[PDB]
């Protein structure tokens, strides 16, 4: 048989920025086995040219067995937490004066602050706290 | 047989920005096995050219067995929490004066603050707290 | 047989921004096995060219068995919580004066604050709290 | 046989922004196994070109068995909660003066605040609280 | 048989910026086995030229068995936390004067601050806290 193939693409612009199987960009993972993933496959396909295939054996007998288990026998956790952001906290004493004229002016200003804030974005503290765990085996 | 293939694409612009199997971008995962995923497959396909296939054997016998179990035997958790944002907190004492004329002016201002805030965005604290856990086995 | 294929696409603009199997972008996962997913497959298909197939064997014998179990034997949880946002909290003392004329003016202002707020966005605290858990086995 | 295929698309603009199997974007998942999903498949198809198929065997014997179980044997939960937003809380003392003329003016203002707010967006706290759980086995 | 192949692409611009199997860029991983991943494969394919294949044996007998287990026997955790950001905290005493004219002006300003903030972005501290764990075996 006679087979003829012709292809003259003009200015082929192909763009592929981010390709991943298990992409974790700018991510924060917690403690005590926070993230558990078995498998992740990503295979994009782009075809532009001529494809000629015949009487082939492409793919057979594919298996994807995955087991993700979370079995702690004796797990003890007293305090568990996480905080992402504590942003834009300010204590300000602002005064603006734009006097343009006057006579015998007496501008007296008094500004006082006493014990404004005691706690701010405070996490996971114990004061005079007692924890008892008597794990005995025989 | 005679087979002829012709393709002349003009300015083919293809764009593929984000492709992933299990994408976790800018994500926060909690504790104690928060996220559990078995499998994740993503395969987009784009075809533009000529495709000629015949009497083939593409794919057979595909299995996707997944088991995700969460079986803690003895799990003890006293305090568990998480806070995402604590934003835009301010305590302000603002004064603006724009006097343009006057005579014998006596502008007296008094501003006082006493114990404004005691707690702010405070999480997961114990004061004089007792926890008892007597785990004994025989 | 004679087979002829012709395709001349003009300015093919294809856009694919976000494709994923199990996409978790900007997501927060809770504790104690919050998120449980077996499998997730996504395969979009786009065809533009000529397709010629004959007497093939594409796909057979596909199985997708998934088991997601949540079986904690002895789970103890005293306090469990999570807060997303605590935004736009302010305590302000604002004064604006725009006097343009006067005579023997006596502007006296008094502003006082005493114990404004005690608690603000406070979560998961125990004071003088006793927890008893006597787990004994024989 | 004779087979002829012709296709000349003009400016094909195809847009695909968000495609996922199990999409969880900007979602918060609760504790104690909040989210449980077996499987999720999404495969959109778009066809524009010529398709010629004959006497094929596309797909057979498809099974999708899914089991999602929630069987905690001994689950103990004292306090469980979650709060999404606590937004736009303000305590303000605002005064505006726009006097344009006067004579022997005596503007005296007094503003006092005493114990305005004790609790604000406070969640899941125990004071002098006793919890008893005597789990004994033989 | 006679086989003829012709391809004259004009200005082929191909771009591939980020391709990875398990991409973790700018990510922070937590303690106690935070991130657990079995496998991740990503193989994008781009075709532009002429492809001629016949009576081949491409791929068979593929298996992807993955097991991810989290089985701590005796796990003890007292305090577990992590904080991402503590940004834009300021305490300011700002005064602006733009007087343009006056006569016998007496501008007296008093600004005082006493014990403004005690705690700020303070995490995971114990004061006078006692922890008891009697793990004995026989």
DSSP codes, C24-68: -SS-EE-TTT-EEEEEEEE--EEE-S-EE--S-B----EE--EEE
Distance from CA of D128 to the nearest CA of C (A): 5
Q: How far is residue D32's CA from residue A83's CA, in Å, rounded to a whole number?
A: 20
Q: How far is residue B97's CA from residue B110's CA, in Å, rounded to a whole number?
A: 14
* B and A in touch (3+ CB pairs within 8 angstroms): yes
Give Cα A115 to chain centroid, integer Å.
37
Q: How far from each other are the two terminal CA atoms of chain B, in whole angstroms?
A: 83
Q: How far is residue D28's CA from residue A53's CA, in Å, rounded to a whole number?
A: 48
Residues 24-63 of chain A with CB under 8 A from chain E are 24-63
Say yes or no for a CB contact (<8 Å) between A34 and C29: yes
| E3's tokens | 């086989």
Strands B2-7 and C2-7 turn out to be parallel
Torsion angle, alpha carbons of D34, D38, D43, D44, to 10: -50
Dihedral sign of CA atoms D6, D10, D11, D12 in order: negative
Burial of A74 (0-12, 13-18, 19+ CB in 10 A): buried
B-interface mutation test, from A31, A39, A128, most B Cβ less than 10 A away: A39
Say yes or no for a CB contact (<8 Å) between A23 and B22: yes
Torsion angle, alpha carbons of A9, A13, A17, A22, to 10: -20
Cβ count within 10 A of residue D54 = 10
Q: How many CA atoms lie within 13 A of E79 on its CB side?
A: 17
Q: Are A58 and B59 in contact (CB under 8 A)?
A: yes
Three-point CA angle B34, C39, D25, nearest 5°: 55
A20 neighbourhood in chain B, CB within 8 Å: 19-21, 23
Cβ count within 10 A of residue D40 = 18
Q: Are C135 and A136 in contact (CB under 8 A)?
A: no
C28 neighbourhood in chain A, CB within 8 Å: 84
Beta strands per DSSP E along B8-80: 13-20, 28-29, 35-42, 45-47, 51-52, 62-63, 66-70, 74-80
| E35's tokens | 């991130």
Q: Are C116 and D113 in contact (CB under 8 A)?
A: yes
Residue of B nearest to C107 (CA): B107
Q: How far is residue D100's CA from residue E88's CA, in Å, rounded to a whole number?
A: 40
Q: How far is CA E41 from CA A43, D71, E12, E63, E100, in A?
A: 8, 35, 27, 13, 72
Q: How far from each other are the two terminal CA atoms of chain D, in whole angstroms?
A: 83
| C103's tokens | 């005579």
Q: How far is residue E63's CA from residue C16's CA, in Å, rounded to a whole number?
A: 30
Q: How far is residue C112's CA from residue A114's CA, in Å, rounded to a whole number?
A: 12
Cβ count within 10 A of residue D85 = 12
Residues 73-102 of chain C with CB under 8 A from chain B are 73-102
Q: How far is residue C105's CA from residue D107's CA, in Å, rounded to a whole number?
A: 8
Q: How far is residue B21's CA from residue B92's CA, in Å, rounded to a whole number?
A: 49
| DSSP label at residue A14 | E
Q: Nearest CB to C42: which of B39, B42, B78?
A: B42
CA nearest neighbour of C125 among D130, D86, B127, B76: B127
What resolution in angstroms, rounded to 1 decimal? 3.0
Say yes or no for a CB contact (<8 Å) between C59 and B62: yes
Q: How far from each other are the two terminal CA atoms of chain C, in whole angstroms?
A: 83
Q: How far is residue E30's CA from residue E80's CA, in Å, rounded to a whole number?
A: 10
Say yes or no for a CB contact (<8 Å) between B21 and E42: yes
Does residue B35 sit in helix, strand or coil?
Answer: strand
* D and B in touch (3+ CB pairs within 8 angstroms): yes
Say yes or no for a CB contact (<8 Å) between D21 and B42: yes
Q: How far is residue C97's CA from residue B97's CA, in Å, rounded to a whole number?
A: 5
| E91's tokens | 């305490």
Distance from CA of A34 to the nearest CA of B (A): 4
Q: Are A51 and B54 in contact (CB under 8 A)?
A: no
CA nearest neighbour of C65 among A81, E24, A123, B68: B68
Residues paired with residue B33 on neighbouring β-strands, in sequence order: none
A39 neighbourhood in chain C, CB within 8 Å: none
B108 neighbourhood in chain C, CB within 8 Å: 107-109
* E and C in touch (3+ CB pairs within 8 angstroms): no
Distance from CA of B17 to the nearest CA of C (A): 5
């Amino acid at each position: 048989g006679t087979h003829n193939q012709w292809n003259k693409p003009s200015k082929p612009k192909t763009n592929l920025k981010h390709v991943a199987g298990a992409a974790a960009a700018g991510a924060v993972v917690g403690g005590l086995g926070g993230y558990m993933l078995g498998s992740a496959m990503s295979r994009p396909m782009i075809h532009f040219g001529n494809d000629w295939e015949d009487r082939y054996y492409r793919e057979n007998m594919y298996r994807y067995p995955n087991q993700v288990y979370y079995r702690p026998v004796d797990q003890y956790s007293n305090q568990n937490n996480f905080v992402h952001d504590c942003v834009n906290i300010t204590i300000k004493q602002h005064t603006v004066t734009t006097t343009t004229k006057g006579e015998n002016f007496t501008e007296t200003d008094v500004k006082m602050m006493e014990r404004v804030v005691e706690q701010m974005c405070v996490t996971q503290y114990q004061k005079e706290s007692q924890a008892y765990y008597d794990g005995r085996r025989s």
